[PDB]
Every structure is written in structure tokens, then in C-alpha cells.
Design a protein around this nucleic acid. Structure first.
Ligand SMILES: [Mg+2]
Ligand SMILES: [Mg+2]
Ligand SMILES: [Mg+2]
Ligand SMILES: [Zn+2]
Lengths: 131, 141, 94, 136, 38
RNA sequence: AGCCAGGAUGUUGGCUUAGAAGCAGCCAUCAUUUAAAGAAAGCGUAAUAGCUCACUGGUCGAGUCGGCCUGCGCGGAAGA
């Protein structure tokens, strides 16, 4: 029931998870195999977190209307499709790891796996934790 | 492979891996013979389903053989052997379609959580529980 | 809450009533209580849409005639013999 | 074929068929086949429409026949002159006026009843409509 | 083709067209479904 | 509407237990996996394949879909 207000609520409910957790991801729509796509989504929902929602309400208007409360640079709805997956175990978690590793492996596309850094001051791998 | 390349779905219970004598020649599109039917399935399906429902993979790989990722014991063979009542659909309204208890589902999960998984291990348990209970009956235990 | 706008009927009888129904209205009567019955005319399509609801015939209706609001109840309805039309409606007061 | 058992008079005047009908409401079931036209409904037509309804809805629910023929129609045999008394009763008809509910159906989904009434209406010489029961 | 007085869509692929004042049924799936006159 | 695409590996379904084959008879049976898995749509429907009930995402930017009443038309409409 993707209605006017329903998609208005969908954007806010999908942006709340991003503002409360870590960077999310997406998945495009070019070609999908039964076993390949399901197992990848099954593995993604296991490692990154069971709260992953492949639902997509990221239209060029709905995304910029609700989500833009924080990080007003969220007008990149140019993706071919969206399949979201949160990262509870810290930032740049297995969600980011799986998306960055499956962007060119065992998948068609992942909407370039741009990511959503919380401060967005600069783009960094954040792969170093000196200790 | 679990994703059978030639998924001609006609295969007798896991006692004899995909018995063509019981499937007949209507599923003759498969090319299974003694080279790739009695080597892996007939040797690795003993503790999965002994005379119980377990489909046999008819996949043929590209390496002149048939060998790829299989899965854990069938849910329809574990949750029913741990239940006793071998009934199901078709006659699920007149009588019980089998027993689907918490213990039966837990045992099915503990047996089929190796490779047959979903969004999580408990999700695979939910798949096992649904595979046992959706036959038409579920036990209140 | 159902609000019906009514007009007091000037002429009454067979000829006048048929002229109303040709004019896409239909006659109605408000009786009951202590005061005299009031013959009104209602605009057919709005009342027909409202009466499509089952609760039209159970709740208390308000009829706006001459500015004065009247709490009424649908007492009886005369339907067209074979058409989805209303010929006449009885309204008991309160 | 409906027919009155033990009627009082064998033959009846032709009469006329003026006026609107009386049983114009869905009284017994929830859906009705209402006649918007005027004419005669023979016993054969009533039976044929009933069978079409009873087969479209596979003998499920309840079907009421609100009309009963009870009017004998006479015909003269072929190659007989005019006069020499009134003809022999050949069949029975029910006089139908516009608004007459002919059939009622209950215990059936609305769209299935609509299709069942469509099949029955194709068997009838009078134009008909589908009607549902109303509060008051 | 069929030249019945009553022409309808017999399946989903039937389309009703009105070429030259005649109401026709053209089907891309079943040539038996070709009907001529409204 | 068209276009960028998709929709089981418990599942010959526990299933009339030789399946009646991800959608013959077969009963229900998302069964997390949902931009999708219906245990069923035309292909293969007894069956692989690439299209694909439905279902959305993506594009792209004003309406779109069915009914009801009513005016005037159309077909039904062939003779010496
Ligand atoms: Mg007069
Ligand atoms: Mg021409
Ligand atoms: Mg004409
Ligand atoms: Zn057709």
C-alpha cells in the first residue's frame, strides 16, 4: 500500500533506523538468480542483522522529502533499486563489508554501495583501529 | 548442487537416491547414471532420511561430474520421524496431518541448521517449524 | 452524521410529485411528535448516495429545512419499482 | 414445471398486464433477479432459468422462486377454424410486471450470484436486473 | 473467423477493435478467437 | 502505460504416500529468506529451458481505473 502518506511514513521510518544505527546499503535490479540472491540475502540478514529490510521506498521524491532531515546530501536516489540492511555491530560492520565484497562478486549490482557516513565530513575507509 | 541444473522433480525417498524405476520415464530429461548417481548421494544420504521424504539432487556440474553444495537433513524427514505420524496434506482435515510440537521443531532445527538456513539460524528453525506444522495439523506441545 | 438539506414543498399531489422526480428531486414527509407534518423535497442523488449506507436507516438524521434543524429518523422509504431511485421517504421526528 | 394442482377453473380470460408489481423487494434471500420489463413467464422458462441458476451455483445456497404461473394459456390446434369454443390449455404462465422479483438467492457470494443470475436471465423473455436486499 | 452477432473477449489476449465500422475481436494467442461483427 | 529487473536449495511438498514435477489430478501448505517464493498463470503445464499469474522496485512525470444512470448513434439487418 505505497500511498502518498504511506510512502511519507515509509521514508521517515526508514530514515529513523539510519539516524539511530550505522551506515546502510542498497541493491540494484539488473538480474537475479533464485539460489544466488536468496542465499546472499539470507547471509546478509544473518551477519549484518535480522532487521535488514530489502523494501524500497527510495523514489526520487519520497527519499528527498522524508530522509533529508539530516545529511541533506541524501538526494542520490539515482540507484537502480534499493535493498536496505542495517549494521548494529558498530559502524562499517559486516553490512558494509558484505556490500563492498559482493558489489562485484556473486551479485549483479549493489547500487555502487556508496554508504552513509554519519558526519559525512570526508570519505574514509575507516579500516584502521590502532590499539 | 542444491540448485539442480536439470531439476526434473521425480525422485523416490532417500532410501534409494532418485529411483528412476519409481519415477518412470516421464522425468527422462535427466542424464543420471551409475557415474554420478550412486557415488555421492548413495554414500552421503544414510543419516539424512532412511525411508523418509528427502528429494535427491539431479544437478550435473561442468567438471565432467556432479558435485556441489548439498544441505542438511530434510525438514520433511526429520520433523516427521521425530513426530511419528507420517500423515500430511490431502487428508489433513479428516485426520491429523502429523505432529508438530516444540520438541519436534527444535529437533528438526538442530538437525537441519547446518546448511539449510535463511535470514538466521532461528529463521531456519522457523522454516523447519512451518514445514512440520503447515501440513494441516500441529500438536499443542 | 447525515445532514440533509430540504425545501418546503409548495405544491403537492400526483402532478407536482412527478415534476419533482423529473427535476431530480423527490418528495418527503416529516411527521411525528406534536407539531404538524412537514412536506419537504430532497435532492435525489445526494440522498440516494447517503441512503446507500446501512446506518442511514438506524442513526438520527438532521434535516436542514428553512434553516431550522430537525432531528429525524428514517421511518419508511418508497423505492422506485425497478430503478435505483427513491420515490418518497417518511421521517419521524427525533 | 410449476403448475397449480387442482385449480378451480380450467380456462381463464386473457386479461391484461397493466401496472407495476407487488413483490418488489428481496424478501427471502440476499440477492434477487428483478424484472424491469413486462410480459409472461411460462413454466418452461421459469424451470429453465432455475436450472441455469442451480448449475451456475453448484446446488449451493438456497434459491427462491417468487413467481408461480397459476394462469392457464389455451391454444387452438393447427388447422381449426375460429370459434367452436375456447382452446385447450397448453401451458401455464406467470404475469410479470416491472419491479417483480423473480428469484432470490442466499448463501452465495455476490459475484457468483451475479453470474448465476446472468445465466438465468439469458433464458427469460423479460429484461431483468440484479438486486440486493435493503434495510427498509 | 466467427461472424456471430455477439462478439466478446474469449481470453486475456483478445482485443476489441472497430475497424471500418465493424466491431472485431483480434487475438494474438488464439486464431480461433477471431470474431467479426459487433 | 512502456521501459532496468527479479520470484526456493526444507519443497519427486508433509503432499491419493509410483511425486503426478518451483505452477497435471492432489490438499492447502510465504514455508524467515519478502525491489519477490504463488506451493500456482500459458508455455513443460506429467516434465528441464528462456520468457514469465501476481507483486513491487527503477525509470518518468499528469492523471488513471473500473463500474451506475442517462441523450444520440453502431452491428444484429437476406427476396424475388
Ligand atoms: Mg395526471
Ligand atoms: Mg476493406
Ligand atoms: Mg440498432
Ligand atoms: Zn483470444
Amino acid at each position: 500500500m505505497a500511498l502518498n502518506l504511506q510512502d511519507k511514513q515509509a521514508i521517515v521510518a526508514e530514515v529513523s533506523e539510519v539516524a539511530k544505527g550505522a551506515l546502510s546499503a542498497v541493491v540494484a535490479d539488473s538480474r537475479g538468480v533464485t539460489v544466488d540472491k536468496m542465499t546472499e540475502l539470507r547471509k546478509a540478514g544473518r551477519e549484518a542483522g535480522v532487521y535488514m529490510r530489502v523494501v524500497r521506498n527510495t523514489l526520487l521524491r519520497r527519499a528527498v522529502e522524508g530522509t533529508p532531515f539530516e545529511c541533506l546530501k541524501d538526494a542520490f536516489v539515482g540507484p537502480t533499486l534499493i535493498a536496505y540492511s542495517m549494521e548494529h555491530p558498530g559502524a562499517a560492520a559486516r553490512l558494509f563489508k558484505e556490500f563492498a565484497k559482493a558489489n562485484a562478486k556473486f551479485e549483479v549490482k549493489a547500487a555502487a554501495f556508496e554508504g552513509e557516513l554519519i558526519p559525512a565530513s570526508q570519505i574514509d575507509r575507516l579500516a584502521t583501529l590502532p590499539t | 548442487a542444491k540448485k539442480v541444473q536439470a531439476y526434473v522433480k521425480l525422485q523416490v525417498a532417500a532410501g534409494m537416491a532418485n529411483p528412476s524405476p519409481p519415477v518412470g520415464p516421464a522425468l527422462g530429461q535427466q542424464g543420471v547414471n551409475i557415474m554420478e548417481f550412486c557415488k555421492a548421494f548413495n554414500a552421503k544420504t544414510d543419516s539424512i532420511e532412511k525411508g523418509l521424504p528427502i528429494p535427491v539432487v539431479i544437478t550435473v556440474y561442468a567438471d565432467r561430474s556432479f558435485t556441489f553444495v548439498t544441505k542438511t537433513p530434510p525438514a520433511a524427514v526429520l520433523l516427521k520421524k521425530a513426530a511419528g505420524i507420517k500423515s500430511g496434506s490431502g487428508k489433513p482435515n479428516k485426520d491429523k496431518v502429523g505432529k508438530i510440537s516444540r520438541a519436534q521443531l527444535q529437533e528438526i532445527a538442530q538437525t537441519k541448521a547446518a546448511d539449510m538456513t535463511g535470514a538466521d539460524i532461528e529463521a531456519m528453525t522457523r522454516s523447519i517449524e512451518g514445514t512440520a506444522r503447515s501440513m494441516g495439523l500441529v500438536v499443542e506441545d | 452524521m447525515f445532514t440533509i438539506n430540504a425545501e418546503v414543498r409548495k405544491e403537492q399531489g400526483k402532478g407536482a410529485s412527478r415534476r419533482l422526480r423529473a427535476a431530480n428531486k423527490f418528495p418527503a414527509i416529516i411527521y411525528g411528535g406534536k407539531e404538524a407534518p412537514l412536506a419537504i423535497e430532497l435532492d435525489h442523488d445526494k440522498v440516494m448516495n447517503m441512503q446507500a449506507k446501512a446506518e442511514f436507516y438506524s442513526e438520527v438524521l438532521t434535516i436542514v429545512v428553512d434553516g431550522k434543524e430537525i432531528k429525524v429518523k428514517a421511518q419508511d422509504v418508497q423505492r422506485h419499482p425497478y430503478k435505483p431511485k427513491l420515490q418518497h421517504i417518511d421521517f419521524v421526528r427525533a | 414445471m410449476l403448475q397449480p394442482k387442482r385449480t378451480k377453473f380450467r380456462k381463464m380470460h386473457k386479461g391484461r398486464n397493466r401496472g407495476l408489481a407487488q413483490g418488489t423487494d428481496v424478501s427471502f434471500g440476499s440477492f434477487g433477479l428483478k424484472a424491469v420489463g413486462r410480459g409472461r413467464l411460462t413454466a418452461r422458462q421459469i424451470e429453465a432459468a432455475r436450472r441455469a441458476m442451480t448449475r451456475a451455483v453448484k446446488r449451493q445456497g438456497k434459491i427462491w422462486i417468487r413467481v408461480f404461473p397459476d394462469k392457464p394459456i389455451t391454444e387452438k390446434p393447427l388447422a381449426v377454424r375460429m370459434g367452436k369454443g375456447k382452446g385447450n390449455v397448453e401451458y401455464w404462465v406467470a404475469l410479470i410486471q416491472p419491479g417483480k422479483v423473480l428469484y432470490e438467492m442466499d448463501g452465495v457470494p455476490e459475484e457468483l450470484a451475479r453470474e448465476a443470475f446472468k445465466l438465468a436471465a439469458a433464458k427469460l423473455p423479460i429484461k431483468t436486473t440484479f438486486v440486493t436486499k435493503t434495510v427498509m | 473467423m466467427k461472424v456471430r452477432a455477439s462478439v466478446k473477449k474469449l481470453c486475456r489476449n483478445c482485443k476489441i477493435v472497430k475497424r471500418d465500422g465493424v466491431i472485431r475481436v483480434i487475438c494474438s494467442a488464439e486464431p480461433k478467437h477471431k470474431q467479426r461483427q459487433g
